[model samples]
Target: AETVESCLAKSHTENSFTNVWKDDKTLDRYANYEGCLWNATGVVVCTGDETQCYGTWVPIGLAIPEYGDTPIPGYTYINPLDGTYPPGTEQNPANPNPSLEESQPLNTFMFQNNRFRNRQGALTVYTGTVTQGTDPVKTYYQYTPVSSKAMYDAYWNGKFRDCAFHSGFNEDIFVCEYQGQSSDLPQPPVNA
Candidate 1:
């Protein structure tokens, strides 16, 4: 019953802004950026062109290290070689902050099968969901609370975060969530 506009409206918080490089086709790749995510996949996107006022959106599941944020289980958190995040991490100060609105997590729900590895380098698969919204959303994909296994097998549920890799591969699903450090590459949580 809720339209995209309505969903975004309730999600509106104080405006935040940032700037970096904008080309004729796209914005330059900074260590961190803001944008809305459609469903649980695809590139980060804004609702309209640069002129619209809705502002950029950050999915609740996203946990940017820039903000010392982590990822929800069903979503992906990436920290490129630009590496780590926030203070110790090297990024473009030239990139100004931008006005941003956070999304209501459940408003956009989905399911994903993720393939990834562990710190020990073994392949893993995790299936889970992110509820609510904003910088630090809720998760059921971690090693705690016995959610990891429950969410796997058949987690035909809402908003996805599947990071099953190598041995965890399931021939499915990108895309999203915070930038972490380099040595910390995106990996599944510990199962022990």
Candidate 2:
């Protein structure tokens, strides 16, 4: 039996890429990588005789292309407010020991996107120290993306630490550099 953790833990082997496509020679191209989360669901049938493969395994020394938002294997902490991913660019650099007043704004949930390109309003609160960078340092971090505004207001408002428009699947809709999801993100809030 395979589990998400065990499957994710298995080392991606050379057979990884070779199985990307099916052929007359190999029978279980996709099934072979069962340990890596490959399965029948969300199959991507290629243009020819090729069958779609799903999994988190990418070849060790190579980059793989994502065919739209195929629900990339593994978990991405989704934001509750806009139901979008964090901005690709860092709005603010990691701060060390920020003042209470300086970090207060992080509590507010501000939405940002390509159209709404205001960087000043986007904020992330300092959670605590984490060991990262070139060497080990006590780098303060914004809270996990899972920390939603309501959750913060209820559990962590006074405490510190708080937290995409993609179209539906197979639509092949891409605006600017952002590839719309097969499923779209929540629309911007109407005037309230």
Candidate 3:
């Protein structure tokens, strides 16, 4: 496996195209790439199904994308993955620094507004599960999705608090962008 840089490159994150609907395979009027952060272990071109993909981060300045809000990751780090990914995707000249503390207003979460239907607020979900075993065993699964906009936190999370990377059968294959678990203390939020 190669570094995330190489994989993201293949995913075409540098292509500068706004959003392409997988079903229709078309481009849109919206377009912006203030640079992006990718998994160092390669978040792109995995599974080889062409359905595999990577996650990116950028600030708001385009067609009002349906975005999520979270704290500026870095010194006041949010998740274990917080300070562990790529940053400094902000300029052409390329000022590279991994410190999220001094980065701009937005960090961890971002997306294209037009992608949402009728420009409506996006859906955010929160969940907690339990499991215990020894000679005997049991398991429980619980989840909650916040549909209220009034509950918005720091203006970033109207739908939910700390975000999480829901996973599949693979190990950390979910490629979490930002998330918080129950045992972990919650961090404050921010918006620009």
Candidate 4:
């Protein structure tokens, strides 16, 4: 785990790149190639002109080439609004704060030749499965280019409201940056 200071510094770095729009009309022209960062996972795109925000959760474990390192193993990715993993799923069996809230089933997607063009116009694609799960049981799927784009657009358009585990609340979506626990701050309830 990174230190609190390091986490905060990292958060600052991430926050610098976060782009959240209350209205889709505000989406930049180049937004097509930019992905939303959800905690550690990636969201394909943001959608809607108003009263709706959508994006698909890219599978966890997709290597971030910019980081040049693999994601921390066994750490399942989740939309923060959906809450973190439930108890008994951590790679560290000793985690004392097992959550009572059961985690939603993992959703997996495989990217084909689709690539992300960074601000610099450089492109990169994943050549493997993007898995999302706590452990023991993992879900998988191959998301076609059209399906991935459709899912991202649909989610951004608020079409997945009927889906299980969907958060009914409609709030401004943000790219979260987790600052490590502060010494002077009380620890958050373990289950949250």
Instruction: Extract clashing residue pairs from model 2.
Output: 166-180, 166-181, 168-182, 169-182
Candidate 2 or 4, higher lDDT?
A: 2
Report the C-alpha lDDT of model 3 over 1-192, residue by residue, as the tens digit.
333454345442321121311211121122223333322121111111211222222222322222223222221112111222222333111123211122111112321111111012322221223456765655533212222232223234423222222223423222222222112111221111
lDDT of 1 by residue, 106-149 (tens): 11222221222232321122223334556777434321111133
Considering only N, C-alpha and C atoms within 3 Å, which residue pairs clash in candidate 3? 65-112, 65-113, 66-113, 69-156, 163-179
In terms of TM-score, how similar is model 2 to the real structure? 0.19
Model 1 scores a TM of 0.16
Lowest summed lDDT window (length 10), candidate 2 = 183-192
lDDT tens digits by residue: candidate 2, 20-46: 432211122333444343322222222
The full ranking of all candidates by lDDT, starting with the best, is 2, 3, 1, 4
Q: Judged by lDDT against the true structure, how good is candidate 2? A: 0.28
lDDT of each: 0.24, 0.28, 0.24, 0.23
Q: Pick the candidate with the highest lDDT.
A: 2
Instruction: Candidate 4: list runs displaced more than 4 Å.
Output: 1-14, 18-161, 165-192
Per-candidate TM-score against the hidden true structure: 0.16, 0.19, 0.18, 0.16
lDDT, candidate 1, equals 0.24
Model 3, position 80, has a per-residue lDDT of: 17
Candidate 3 local accuracy as lDDT? Answer: 0.24
Off by over 4 Å in 1: 1-78, 84-119, 122-169, 174-192
